[PDB]
Design a protein around this motif. Sequence first.
Motif, PDB file in Angstrom:
ATOM      1  N   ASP A   1       0.821  -1.207   0.000  1.00 36.33           N
ATOM      2  CA  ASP A   1       0.000   0.000   0.000  1.00 36.33           C
ATOM      3  C   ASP A   1       0.856   1.260   0.000  1.00 36.33           C
ATOM      4  O   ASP A   1       0.456   2.290  -0.556  1.00 36.33           O
ATOM      5  CB  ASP A   1      -0.931  -0.015   1.209  1.00 36.33           C
ATOM      6  N   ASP A   2       2.038   1.189   0.615  1.00 31.22           N
ATOM      7  CA  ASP A   2       2.981   2.302   0.569  1.00 31.22           C
ATOM      8  C   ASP A   2       3.456   2.551  -0.856  1.00 31.22           C
ATOM      9  O   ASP A   2       3.563   3.699  -1.303  1.00 31.22           O
ATOM     10  CB  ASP A   2       4.163   1.992   1.483  1.00 31.22           C
ATOM     11  N   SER A   3       3.704   1.477  -1.601  1.00 27.13           N
ATOM     12  CA  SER A   3       4.115   1.623  -2.989  1.00 27.13           C
ATOM     13  C   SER A   3       2.939   2.021  -3.883  1.00 27.13           C
ATOM     14  O   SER A   3       3.132   2.672  -4.917  1.00 27.13           O
ATOM     15  CB  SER A   3       4.771   0.323  -3.442  1.00 27.13           C
ATOM     16  N   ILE A   4       1.713   1.678  -3.483  1.00 31.62           N
ATOM     17  CA  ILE A   4       0.535   2.195  -4.176  1.00 31.62           C
ATOM     18  C   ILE A   4       0.400   3.700  -3.945  1.00 31.62           C
ATOM     19  O   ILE A   4       0.023   4.457  -4.850  1.00 31.62           O
ATOM     20  CB  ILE A   4      -0.718   1.416  -3.727  1.00 31.62           C
ATOM     21  N   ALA A   5       0.741   4.162  -2.740  1.00 31.68           N
ATOM     22  CA  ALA A   5       0.792   5.599  -2.482  1.00 31.68           C
ATOM     23  C   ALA A   5       1.916   6.271  -3.264  1.00 31.68           C
ATOM     24  O   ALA A   5       1.797   7.445  -3.632  1.00 31.68           O
ATOM     25  CB  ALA A   5       0.951   5.862  -0.986  1.00 31.68           C
ATOM     26  N   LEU A   6       3.013   5.548  -3.511  1.00 31.24           N
ATOM     27  CA  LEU A   6       4.023   6.022  -4.459  1.00 31.24           C
ATOM     28  C   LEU A   6       3.470   6.128  -5.872  1.00 31.24           C
ATOM     29  O   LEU A   6       3.876   7.016  -6.628  1.00 31.24           O
ATOM     30  CB  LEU A   6       5.235   5.097  -4.470  1.00 31.24           C
ATOM     31  N   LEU A   7       2.584   5.209  -6.261  1.00 27.17           N
ATOM     32  CA  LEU A   7       1.898   5.361  -7.542  1.00 27.17           C
ATOM     33  C   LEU A   7       0.950   6.553  -7.533  1.00 27.17           C
ATOM     34  O   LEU A   7       0.680   7.137  -8.587  1.00 27.17           O
ATOM     35  CB  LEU A   7       1.118   4.102  -7.901  1.00 27.17           C
ATOM     36  N   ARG A   8       0.422   6.912  -6.365  1.00 22.44           N
ATOM     37  CA  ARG A   8      -0.472   8.059  -6.278  1.00 22.44           C
ATOM     38  C   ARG A   8       0.308   9.357  -6.097  1.00 22.44           C
ATOM     39  O   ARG A   8       0.171  10.291  -6.894  1.00 22.44           O
ATOM     40  CB  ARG A   8      -1.469   7.849  -5.139  1.00 22.44           C
ATOM     41  N   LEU A   9       1.138   9.428  -5.062  1.00 19.00           N
ATOM     42  CA  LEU A   9       1.861  10.651  -4.739  1.00 19.00           C
ATOM     43  C   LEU A   9       3.243  10.655  -5.375  1.00 19.00           C
ATOM     44  O   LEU A   9       3.919   9.625  -5.432  1.00 19.00           O
ATOM     45  CB  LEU A   9       1.982  10.812  -3.224  1.00 19.00           C
ATOM     46  N   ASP A  10       3.665  11.831  -5.839  1.00 15.72           N
ATOM     47  CA  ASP A  10       4.964  11.981  -6.484  1.00 15.72           C
ATOM     48  C   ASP A  10       6.073  12.373  -5.519  1.00 15.72           C
ATOM     49  O   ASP A  10       7.216  11.933  -5.692  1.00 15.72           O
ATOM     50  CB  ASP A  10       4.882  13.024  -7.601  1.00 15.72           C
TER      51      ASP A  10
END
Lengths: 127, 63, 181, 112
Positions: free
Chosen positions: C77-86
């Motif tokens: 989920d942290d890496s999904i937030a990396l997909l979301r946030l730059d």
Amino acid sequence: SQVFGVARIYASFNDTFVHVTDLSGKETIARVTGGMKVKADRDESSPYAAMLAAQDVAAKCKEVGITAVHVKIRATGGTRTKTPGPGGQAALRALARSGLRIGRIEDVTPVPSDSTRKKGGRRGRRL
Amino acid sequence: TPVTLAKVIKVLGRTGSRGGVTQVRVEFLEDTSRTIVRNVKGPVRENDILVLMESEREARRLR
Amino acid sequence: KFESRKIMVPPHRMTPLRNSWTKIYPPLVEHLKLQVRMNLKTKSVELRTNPKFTTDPGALQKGADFIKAFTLGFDLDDSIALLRLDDLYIETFEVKDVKTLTGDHLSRAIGRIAGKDGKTKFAIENATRTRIVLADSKIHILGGFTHIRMARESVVSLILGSPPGKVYGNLRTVASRLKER
Amino acid sequence: IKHTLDIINVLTDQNPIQVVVDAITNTGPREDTTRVGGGGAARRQAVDVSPLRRVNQAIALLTIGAREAAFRNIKTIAETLAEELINAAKGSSTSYAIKKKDELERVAKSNR
């Protein structure tokens, strides 16, 4: 296809170098710095200033017309940290974002076989 | 003057420090393909119509 | 107009990879519109984008960051937030980059960074709004640039022998002076 | 209101109820500002106020402007309110709520 270049990204704890060269390490084509971009002394090596410098590099390469680059990201190496920082990470994000052709991503960090004495003393260097 | 016409489609909740402003998902009225996130001061139910000015401005969160 | 990157997979991370792969690849394929292949023989994740997909060249970079951060041991989920946030990035350091340690000094330093039941480490991640992988000699920090800088200050505080109580003090100091602004 | 509709008749507006509705429409601030926290130095952020609040806001501004104008003069509440509704049914910047609508929208445009 595209005209291949050699991109070299140095990542010091205070600075980020983006360095476009021709084949065989011929001559410097596009070369700016986070220092010469953003005048804030806090923001000398921000990912923001790194992206701005990388887009300046992309703009000068499109001024020359060379599109493809073989990119060699590079940490400090030697005895300091051997993984290139988020300045280089955001520089790669910007050079992808600026639509330049990327031939090959490689992480060339100079690793010593067996290091000499660092400038930290027995205590530890920083903080 | 560009009078942006808008549609409320999805409410996101109550935000702001005082707990007064509303984040609203917006179907743009003239062109269906734009879905914007806007900040609305006042009472809004589903399928209401808004009058914005800029379709291109989006604000992440508020305090 | 394809563009292809490859990244290696270590077997240490390959078992969570082959377990959570069914959640890893569809958001890259559908939610990010990237072509994702896997050579499990060479242990190589192959991210290529096509003219079929949306022309987002930064999405390929964020997908490479996704696969790289999961390869580095970070959560899904942290890496999904990396997909979301730059603005979220990764620091990576060694122990010997800061202070030379040998034998049980290294083990005790890792234990003092972790703390009992991770309570020293987890209290970092709540109060730095970052995520950390403590590898063997490697540290990996994931978050905002100011936030990974503050996590670097905290871990360099921990690595030089300072007690965890002073780290809690500086931690609540930084958290109070950051949440207020 | 009955006197005012009579005045808007005699001031050559054959549809005084349409004058009322057009003053409601032409004096509603579409977007305004709220006072966000902002980290100490509290900036003001443009929110896009609801059209029910735009109706509330326009009626409030018109009644405030009419109560300001009718106070301390010989001119009656009906004549001042009719003057405001006629100068506000079509934007003229000689009424009250046109000016304050413009002020709220320019603060909103300056502060987005």
